[PDB]
Design a protein around this ligand. Structure first.
Ligand SMILES: CCCCCCCCCCCCCCCC(=O)O
Length: 119
């Protein structure tokens, strides 16, 4: 039971609205969601297939997403992910505040900030 569960439907709605004909932002981002300091759920934001999917807890890579495929990963509090997803804060703001850990290409999350703004 994550706070993030409350916004997944709306995110899926936005994904469904994305134009399929001209794809340009196609990163794979791993998201490790924390509660009380521990990772309790992991999901992939797959901008190639335009889907969010739950993956094995805290895993580094999977059959579908081997290491060489993953563009970036973030470890982030459940509530903070919810705040970004509801446009109340941004990944850049969380980085400024030292609230998240990012590996791989950090600019993928900053570009996601920009692309999510008007969606
Ligand atoms: C902050 C979490 C957001 C999770 C992503 C779900 C919201 C959908 C936003 C779609 C933005 C990506 C648009 C890509 C279009 C393109 O390929 O040019």
């Amino acid at each position: 039971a994550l706070k993030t569960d409350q916004i997944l439907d709306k995110l899926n709605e936005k994904l469904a609205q994305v134009d399929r004909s001209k794809r340009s932002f196609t990163v794979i981002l791993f998201v490790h969601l924390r509660q009380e300091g521990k990772v309790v759920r992991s999901v992939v934001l797959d901008f190639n297939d335009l889907k969010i999917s739950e993956i094995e807890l805290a895993v580094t890579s999977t059959a579908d997403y081997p290491a060489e495929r993953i563009d970036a990963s973030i470890t982030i509090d459940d509530n903070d992910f919810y705040l970004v997803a509801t446009k109340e804060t941004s990944f850049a703001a969380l980085i400024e505040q030292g609230k998240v850990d990012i590996t791989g290409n950090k600019q993928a999350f900053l570009t996601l900030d920009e692309k999510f703004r008007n969606k």
